[PDB]
Design an enzyme around this catalytic site. Structure first.
Site, PDB file in Angstrom:
ATOM      1  CG  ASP A   1      -2.034   1.059   1.530  1.00 50.52           C
ATOM      2  OD1 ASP A   1      -2.112   1.404   0.185  1.00 50.52           O
ATOM      3  OD2 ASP A   1      -2.491   1.145   2.378  1.00 50.52           O
TER       4      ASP A   1
ATOM      5  CG  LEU B   1       9.759 -16.269  -5.450  1.00 55.17           C
ATOM      6  CD1 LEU B   1       9.803 -16.302  -3.958  1.00 55.17           C
ATOM      7  CD2 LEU B   1       9.777 -14.698  -6.029  1.00 55.17           C
TER       8      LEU B   1
ATOM      9  CG  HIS C   1      -1.150   2.449  -9.743  1.00 49.85           C
ATOM     10  ND1 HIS C   1      -1.073   2.008  -8.442  1.00 49.85           N
ATOM     11  CD2 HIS C   1      -2.347   2.818  -9.733  1.00 49.85           C
ATOM     12  CE1 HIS C   1      -2.081   2.197  -7.835  1.00 49.85           C
ATOM     13  NE2 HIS C   1      -3.059   2.694  -8.644  1.00 49.85           N
TER      14      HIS C   1
HETATM   15  C1  LIG Z   1      -0.712   1.251 -14.230  1.00 51.19           C
HETATM   16  C2  LIG Z   1      -1.031  -0.356 -13.756  1.00 51.19           C
HETATM   17  C3  LIG Z   1       0.445  -0.748 -13.070  1.00 51.19           C
HETATM   18  C4  LIG Z   1       1.015  -1.778 -13.972  1.00 51.19           C
HETATM   19  C5  LIG Z   1       1.320  -2.897 -13.008  1.00 51.19           C
HETATM   20  C6  LIG Z   1       2.703  -3.861 -13.396  1.00 51.19           C
HETATM   21  C7  LIG Z   1       2.568  -5.152 -12.319  1.00 51.19           C
HETATM   22  C8  LIG Z   1       3.787  -5.159 -11.520  1.00 51.19           C
HETATM   23  O1  LIG Z   1       5.070  -5.482 -12.304  1.00 51.19           O
HETATM   24  C9  LIG Z   1       5.358  -6.525 -11.937  1.00 51.19           C
HETATM   25  C10 LIG Z   1       4.388  -7.522 -11.472  1.00 51.19           C
HETATM   26  C11 LIG Z   1       4.601  -8.918 -11.120  1.00 51.19           C
HETATM   27  C12 LIG Z   1       5.773  -9.192 -11.257  1.00 51.19           C
HETATM   28  C13 LIG Z   1       6.740  -8.524 -11.562  1.00 51.19           C
HETATM   29  C14 LIG Z   1       8.064  -9.033 -11.794  1.00 51.19           C
HETATM   30  O2  LIG Z   1       8.850  -8.258 -12.670  1.00 51.19           O
HETATM   31  C15 LIG Z   1      10.255  -8.869 -13.003  1.00 51.19           C
HETATM   32  C16 LIG Z   1      10.522  -9.626 -11.985  1.00 51.19           C
HETATM   33  C17 LIG Z   1      11.860 -10.177 -12.158  1.00 51.19           C
HETATM   34  C18 LIG Z   1      12.645  -9.890 -13.256  1.00 51.19           C
HETATM   35 BR1  LIG Z   1      14.348 -10.408 -13.664  1.00 51.19          BR
HETATM   36  C19 LIG Z   1      12.230  -8.782 -14.044  1.00 51.19           C
HETATM   37  C20 LIG Z   1      10.865  -8.352 -14.141  1.00 51.19           C
HETATM   38  P1  LIG Z   1      10.710  -6.959 -15.279  1.00 51.19           P
HETATM   39  O3  LIG Z   1      10.128  -7.262 -16.803  1.00 51.19           O
HETATM   40  O4  LIG Z   1      12.177  -6.213 -15.291  1.00 51.19           O
HETATM   41  O5  LIG Z   1       9.971  -5.705 -14.751  1.00 51.19           O
HETATM   42  C21 LIG Z   1       6.682  -7.243 -12.045  1.00 51.19           C
END
Ligand SMILES: CCCCCCCCOc1cccc(COc2ccc(Br)cc2P(=O)(O)O)c1
Lengths: 214, 208
Positions: A12, A111, A29
């Protein structure tokens, strides 16, 4: 060493963080997304078995769509991805994308990442109770045979390590209908740090607080 | 305002040890702190106070002599938890204390004796399971509302605030279902030392 197999996080503060900088909620976000990537990489590198994330702010489907663009990169990091929550009323294309993402990473050995999408602790208990009630209705199960161990086997994540630590960023001190059943014995760690600023050192600090307290 | 406060009353044993006294002395100071917290809630218009003794049948016994006074203060006493294997004489006394005060309209005091939050859910699920088996209930009719009706305290205000004394930061399988939206307030103060000022401190955290 830290002792933690399963960490759950109520993420949050995205809104408050954007407000503090004169920015609209969507920048919060996006910073919040960067903070998830950072936490996920930290958890994976620190031997944690499972990380469970609950997106909350003090459009669920938008969050999950957003996540579909991360799935390839999670897979390449050997993360096993699962969505917990009531996804049955979600779009059919979205529900298909979820199934596929889960299928795709189910063989990963690093993980395990659980993302709450339309998740509630009371809902989770209710769904377990409905699966038990069907088994009674079929004549497979006696009301009297139902005990804690049995209901435990029917709630989300029952096959993972129990949740050892719940972290909530953003400064509020409640559960807000996140995990209920599963947190009966968990350590609870509240930090005023807002989600987009919560970084490796903050995560280390919560783990070391769990290790010193357990 | 805060309508229903629940407290996990931890630290009696540790307090005894700090005072260089045997465990029994910590229990006796813990009982005094019970009376003071109950008075404070009755005086401050809290509707319900739910007390979880933690760190049982013997605990319920010590309460037996307080009932007359509670009743005089318009306090509704309920024991929550699995008392079904307590000796039958103690069960009988619980049943009588509850029936005596059941018509009271002041503070409702719930004392959690052999209580577990998971147990509480399970006994509610078992009831629903009986209903299914007798054809009185369809599996798909079961929702949150209906389970809520079968867990402890469903007739009282929702738990607004949970206080844990004693320095630990866990729920320890005290209320689970009922605390979905409650403020959680943790304090290092040991239960025998927790006094009106501490309780107001917690009420302020709620007010903010
Ligand atoms: C406006 C709405 C916001 C968009 C929300 C995005 C969601 C959160 O981004 C994530 C969500 C779940 C898991 C992850 C994990 O991202 C990564 C994890 C490990 C590794 Br290595 C790389 C990534 P990424 O492609 O570099 O961001 C990112």
């Amino acid at each position: 060493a830290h002792g933690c197999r399963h960490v759950a996080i109520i993420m949050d503060g995205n809104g408050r963080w954007a407000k503090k900088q004169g920015k609209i909620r969507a920048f919060g976000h996006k910073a919040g997304a960067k903070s998830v990537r950072r936490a996920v990489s930290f958890a994976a590198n620190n031997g944690i078995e499972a990380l469970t994330l609950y997106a909350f702010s003090s459009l669920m489907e938008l969050f999950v769509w957003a996540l579909d663009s991360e799935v390839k990169s999670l897979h390449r990091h050997n993360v096993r991805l699962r969505i917990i929550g009531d996804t049955s009323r979600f779009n059919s294309r979205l529900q298909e994308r979820i199934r596929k993402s889960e299928a795709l990473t189910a063989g990963n050995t690093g993980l395990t990442l659980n993302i709450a999408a339309n998740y509630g602790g009371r809902w989770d208990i209710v769904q377990g109770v409905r699966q038990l009630a069907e088994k009674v209705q079929q004549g497979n199960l006696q009301p009297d045979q139902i005990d804690e161990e049995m209901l435990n086997q029917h709630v989300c994540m029952h096959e993972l390590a129990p949740v050892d630590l719940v972290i909530r960023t953003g400064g509020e001190h409640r559960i807000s209908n996140f995990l209920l059943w599963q947190i009966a014995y968990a350590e609870l760690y509240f930090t005023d740090v807002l989600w987009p600023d919560f970084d490796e050192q903050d995560f280390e600090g919560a783990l070391n607080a769990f290790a010193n307290r357990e």
